[PDB]
Amino acid sequence: SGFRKMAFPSGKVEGCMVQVTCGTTTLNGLWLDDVVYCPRHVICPNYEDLLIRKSNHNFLVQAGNVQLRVIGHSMQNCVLKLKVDTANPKTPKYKFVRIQPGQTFSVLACYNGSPSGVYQCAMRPNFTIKGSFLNGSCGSVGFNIDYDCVSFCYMHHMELPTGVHAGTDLEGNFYGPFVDRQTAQAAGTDTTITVNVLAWLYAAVINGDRWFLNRFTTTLNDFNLVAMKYNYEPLTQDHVDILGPLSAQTGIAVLDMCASLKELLQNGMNGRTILGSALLEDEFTPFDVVRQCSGVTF
């Protein structure tokens, strides 16, 4: 029993964190084999013009108390790839993956190439992440661990004026309509990840919380007309299919749980909590619920 916001064990990623310095700027890098990946703003804009004026020895890379000597450098979108002399012996089995809004991942927050904390979070529908980052956190990464393979999905780049965060996949493509420079940019209107709230309601039922259940059902169309009014993401048939296992485990049909969510949106919690929360939680995917309420290891 118990339900917590849980991150993947960070060990395989901790062995990849390095410190990258160029001029006055110091941020974090990800050392995998003989390449170090970091945000291209470390050179700061005409990035090609700024990079062409740099030599290998301008980039100081530190792996613990050992200096790595840069032997080459190239740019891929908004990521700088620093070719180093030494291959990382702690390089795990990995993939670079681009995630979709609603998908969750673990963040290993780092300062000066040193991991300080690990937390779990979701890619919001507005492509921002509600992280916890201070100055120096740039280059911190987001990941998932499947079996023994680490899937790198996020690299931190900047903080937006509202306190939320923006970054790229490991190929340097931003999530969202953001650019890596000092300019007027703001997060779009955010929405609640509906499939995630439903998964969290199933996790509450599994942990013995049934007060919100009712005898009612709804059509998918009637539910989406309600959900659109409460700034909730539209629920698709794929979402309904993905929730099938949890529906079978609890005996509550997906459209039956949608009618429970409809009543919570129109009437509130009324002094009650669900899994210790007074708000409807949307940062646990259907897979996170299955993994936590079944005990999958890495």
Ligand X SMILES: Cn1ncc2cncc(NC(=O)Cc3cccc(Cl)c3)c21
The residues annotated with a catalytic role in the active site are 41, 138
* DSSP-assigned beta bridge partners for residue 149: 93, 146
Nearer to a second copy, 16 or 259 (CB): 16
Strands (E), 77-138: 79-84, 93-96, 104-111, 114-122
Q: How many residues does the chain have?
A: 298
| Residue of the chain from 103, 114, 185, 207 that contacts Cl ion (CB under 5 A) | 103
Q: Concatenated DSSP letters for 229-268? A: HTTBPPPPHHHHHHTHHHHHHHT--HHHHHHHHHHHHHH-
Given Cl ion, ligand X, a second copy, none, residue 100, with its beta carbon under 5 to 8 Å by kind, binds Cl ion
Q: Which residues, 256 to 285, sit near a second copy by CB under 8 A? A: 273, 276-279
With CA atoms as reference, report the closest residue to 127 among 191, 182, 78. Answer: 191
> Contact region for ligand X (CB under 6 A) — 157-165, 218-226, 241-249, 268-276?
157-165
With CA atoms as reference, report the closest residue to 155 among 184, 131, 182, 191. Answer: 131
- Per-residue string for binding with a second copy, 16-55, x by CB under 8 A? ----------------------------------------
| Minimum distance of ligand X from residue 126's CB (angstroms) | 17
Nearer to ligand X, 1 or 100 (CB): 1
| Minimum distance of Cl ion from residue 273's CB (angstroms) | 28
> Contact region for a second copy (CB under 8 A) — 81-89, 105-113, 238-246, 257-265?
105-113
| Minimum distance of Cl ion from residue 54's CB (angstroms) | 35
> Contact region for ligand X (CB under 6 A) — 28-36, 94-102, 117-125, 156-164?
156-164
Per rule CB under 6 A, count of chain residues that contact ligand X: 14
| Residue of the chain from 27, 61, 70, 110 that contacts a second copy (CB under 8 A) | 110
Residue 137 sits in the site that holds a second copy (CB under 8 A) = yes
Nearer to a second copy, 15 or 101 (CB): 15
Residue 41 sits in the site that holds ligand X (CB under 6 A) = yes
Q: Round to whole Å and give the CA distance between 41 and 47.
A: 8
Contact 155, 191 (CB under 8 A): no
Q: Which residues, 176 to 215, sit near a second copy by CB under 8 A? A: 207-208
With CA atoms as reference, report the closest residue to 163 among 118, 192, 124, 120. Answer: 124
| Minimum distance of a second copy from residue 197's CB (angstroms) | 15
Q: Which residues are CB-contacts of 256 (< 8 A; sequence separation ≥ 6)?
A: 213, 216, 217
Q: Round to whole Å and give the CA distance between 45 and 72.
A: 22
Q: Both ends of the chain: CA-CA distance in Å?
A: 20
> Contact region for Cl ion (CB under 5 A) — 100-108, 135-143, 192-200, 270-278?
100-108
Residue 40 sits in the site that holds ligand X (CB under 6 A) = no
* DSSP-assigned beta bridge partners for residue 152: 96, 143
> Tokens standing for 25?
């700027």
Q: Round to whole Å and give the CA distance between 152 and 168.
A: 11
- Per-residue string for binding with ligand X, 112-141, x by CB under 6 A? ---------------------xxx-xx---
Residue 182 sits in the site that holds ligand X (CB under 6 A) = yes
Q: Which residues are CB-contacts of 75 (< 8 A; sequence separation ≥ 6)?
A: 40, 47, 48, 51, 81, 172
Residues that bind a second copy (CB under 8 A): 1-11, 14-15, 108-112, 114-121, 130-134, 136-137, 159, 163-165, 207-208, 273, 276-279, 291-298
